[PDB]
Amino acid sequence: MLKYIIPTMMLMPLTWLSKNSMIWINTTLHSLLISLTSLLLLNQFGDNSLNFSLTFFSDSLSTPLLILTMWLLPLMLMASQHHLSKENLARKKLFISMLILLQLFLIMTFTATELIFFYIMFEATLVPTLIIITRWGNQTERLNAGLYFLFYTLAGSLPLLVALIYIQNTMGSLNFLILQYWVQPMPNSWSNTFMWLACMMAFMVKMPLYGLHLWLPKAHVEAPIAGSMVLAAILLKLGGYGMMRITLLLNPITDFMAYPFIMLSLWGMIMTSSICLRQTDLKSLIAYSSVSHMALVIVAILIQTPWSYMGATALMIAHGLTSSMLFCLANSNYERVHSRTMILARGLQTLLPLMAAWWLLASLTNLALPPSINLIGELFVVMSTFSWSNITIILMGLNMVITALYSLYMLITTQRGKHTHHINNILPSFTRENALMSLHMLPLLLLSLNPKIILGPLY
Amino acid sequence: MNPIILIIILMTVMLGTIIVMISTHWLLIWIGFEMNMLAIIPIMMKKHNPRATEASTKYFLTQSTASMLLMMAIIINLMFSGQWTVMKLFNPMASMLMTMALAMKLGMAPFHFWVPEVTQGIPLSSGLILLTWQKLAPMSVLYQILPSINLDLILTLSILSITIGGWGGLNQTQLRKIMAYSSIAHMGWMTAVLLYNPTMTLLNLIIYIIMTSTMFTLFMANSTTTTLSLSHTWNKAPIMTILVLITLLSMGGLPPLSGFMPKWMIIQEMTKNDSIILPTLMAITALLNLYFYMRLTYSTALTMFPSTNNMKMKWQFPTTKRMTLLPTMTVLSTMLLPLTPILSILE
Amino acid sequence: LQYGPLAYILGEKTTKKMTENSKLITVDGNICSGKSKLAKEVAEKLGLKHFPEAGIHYADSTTGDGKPLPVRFSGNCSLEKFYDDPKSNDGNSYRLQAWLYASRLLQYADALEHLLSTGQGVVLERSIYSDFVFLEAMYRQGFIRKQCVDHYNQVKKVTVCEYLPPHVVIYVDVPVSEVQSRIQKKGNPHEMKITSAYLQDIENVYKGTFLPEMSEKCEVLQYSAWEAEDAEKVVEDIQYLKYDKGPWLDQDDRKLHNLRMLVQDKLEVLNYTSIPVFLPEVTIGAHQSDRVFQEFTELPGRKYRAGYNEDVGDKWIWLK
Amino acid sequence: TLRWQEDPEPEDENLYEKNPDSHGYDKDPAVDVWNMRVVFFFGFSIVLVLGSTFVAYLPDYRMQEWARREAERLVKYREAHGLPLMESNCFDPSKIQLPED
């Protein structure tokens, strides 16, 4: 993984040496070139992981997340290059520097061979997201959201540090391959109870688990578009990848331990979805949709069945792409109408036909329309949970209503009806926005043909 | 402030501290302590204002009481041992009296009551000296007496100091009181680890010395003493705002900065000796420390506080102060993490 | 930094150059007292350096090219607008007075540095010890509020107390009618708009507050309108003086060296001038401050330090 | 009274008035056209098309197809020698020592 870290460390002076008018083009070109070279990680096997050295390895689980991350960064640079056109050159270069550092941090975190390196890199991902949220955010109370995000993450992750150092001192190592070959069963003791809690609560915080999800409806709203995308499409999957790695080490206690937590999602993803039925802020609606999808991911990972794992990773990738596209749509509409109120801008189909088509495609991919990746993942999760127990189909099936009952609702109020009279600054669609949304959407429809590369490590 | 007299006084402080370091007799340890405090008294009377006299009076009273306790421990050790080598003591009362004497000297809670006051009333160079160089000698004294240190007393002092320092720094708005309570919390953090592995104590002492020196150097460079002027400094030099932001990020132990190096490795020596609740509790209090650190960076750089009109004249004059060792100590306080095993040189 | 404690160790003593002719002399008066040339005569009598009245662009004049910077970059206050509307909404009055006090403090710091270094006496007009007589003349005319008055009092209390008063002060006594007639005959198109009550208030604060304390803390001389013309009488009076008052008597080499160190750091002189006290006549929000700072950084000769500007023609920038 | 000095709210920038063929990239048309060219070349023509070509032709991914070919051998063996189709024990039972009780 030293063939990708050094290109980002060379991208850093590439955005610190360009002119004031050529930073965006050079950064976009070189990040797209790195995204093109990112496909060499697909040399995987059905039984072995692709190991490069003692510190970096990549199986069939971290590879789609890596590809999504360094495909999302050029999209981030496109999405955040208009509302920062009034900023200072030094602050613009600092913004690009934070984005490049965040991408480097993510691609170093996703390939961490040993778990302590993953933990320190996982906490190191806090700094640029917090800086972006508390600096380039628009609303007044963004400091509260940044403090809530940082403290939820740290209060989750410090018992994770204590448990990881305890495990390393107890058995001898934290390599994932060695722990795959030196695993030991954990008996049903209260020490193992608190060990499971310390190893899990950080990832339940960053997923987020229902009950501890309160850092999402704030930090997803007042943040800018790039911070919203990096919060919605990567870091939750970072927590999911960490939980997937950790849950190997905590058998067979989880079989009688994960009863509340699973069900803390198995009801929560109902009522949070109901919150999307009564939301006046579109970005909060997208954030709560992300909460519901991550609760489904929590259930799939915690029941630890194979089909659940495949559904979890497929829904992870599909929901990340869909939520990034929806956040870009919300940002474009907010730029056009200067308000985040959903009830304000109405009848946008009569003025913006192509944007209405993109809205329709994004809403259809959000409600798991087959044969998209989201339907594949959610269907695999439903099969696995029905294998777990019968009655839980109800707890999924009613969600099958409510998701549609908000998503098409989000499609209706913003697009269908008589248009607003006093709003007369709706410009035609920018080519930048259309390019960004096509770059969001077309990879999903292309991966719908060949999903076998994003179905997990055990396909 | 005669430069010859200031040079001689600084050399006397250095000589007293090194006499504490290099001696093999208890009397010479006390000699170095007495000469150090005697020569550090004029440092806190540099500006000649009554608040400095108040702070120096409180400091002298506390240090003299600690020194009298130190002779009580030495004379008891002489009674029960008949010898004067600086090593493990031969009496539990000697260890107890020595432990709270050094706690009084180092501002460890509940004997910390002079630290947030004295540092409030002295100039920033004297505050830097008191919070950086004064802590070196009793660390050596506590390192050389570790076989006879009672575990319960030093653990109670450590946890009380960490909790009290965090909760006291959670409220103050002055920079010097925040620095004092942060120093108290760091002192408790690196005295909690002393009995298990003193190399971690020395590493945390060096890291805290470097980071506090960077903080105080930035405060003297910006000529800022409260939160509001430190907010106002963004008109003068934004690079200094970036520097104080990154070193305050490092100050709360957030990776990938240098401040995450000691405390995490301190936890690496807590689970070796089968202790789990203790690093969690000190990590939560470190989160409190990071809360008021985050408040300071929110006031400083991550927002843009409203300024006054006279900044324009301050835009026509560069910083003429002797900004000494600021870049080296700023780099050494942020990007020293991949060189973590350098602590091996401290064995 | 050229002058430091190392120079004082090496023998750079400032009372080596402190002869009997090194005197700090400031002259005061009304708005149009005609003292402006009189001090110039002293500059050709005792050989002392003379400094003009600290204007808006004085800080612009001392550094850089010395050209007058535009009012947006420095000051953001005009005397013509003050003469037009003293009770204006934007508060030109107190902003102008605070800016002028800051400029006068810079002028006094430069004067003290020149006197301490070169050993030559310095003649000034309307020093920082005689500026509040303007501001009080505002407050008795209702031109400002009480909060502005106490903010100016706090600024003066935190700024003056680190300096020494001048040796001899000279006040020219010109009455209100003579001042108004001189203003009328001067011909400035905007100077008649002030009421004569402002000049009367200036004279009242001068003869009620300034003189009762400059008769104690320093040496004081007083002259009428016509006796200001006779330069030889004034220089004979100041040259035959017996200095017994003022804290210039008990000044050793250490205190003057500390004063020289403090006046050579221009940031240290003006550090306490702009204290974070939010009075709506002087505070400016983040957006305008950011815009004018980014515009000032784009000015030639000001983007970097004085020795490190390529666009103005400085060579060997890469070897410094 | 009056509050602190502050500029009024700047209006939103309508980009199409100063340029009838602008695309929401930059003020000047030439760098805007260069940005369009680079995004549509290195975003659709370079990464998407060659990426679809690459993922369409991974070299027999995860050996999975090979496994089918191996199955095409194995039952061909076990339908010739009369062995049962698939043993119910993954390992040889003769090399297992059960814990005696």
Partner: peptide, 19 residues
């Protein structure tokens, strides 16, 4: 429209001797 910055109220909240 533009990014919000703290006004006089935030500073006077942070300007007291006790917070």
């Amino acid at each position: 429209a533009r990014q919000w910055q703290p006004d006089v109220e935030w500073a006077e909240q942070y300007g007291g001797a006790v917070m």
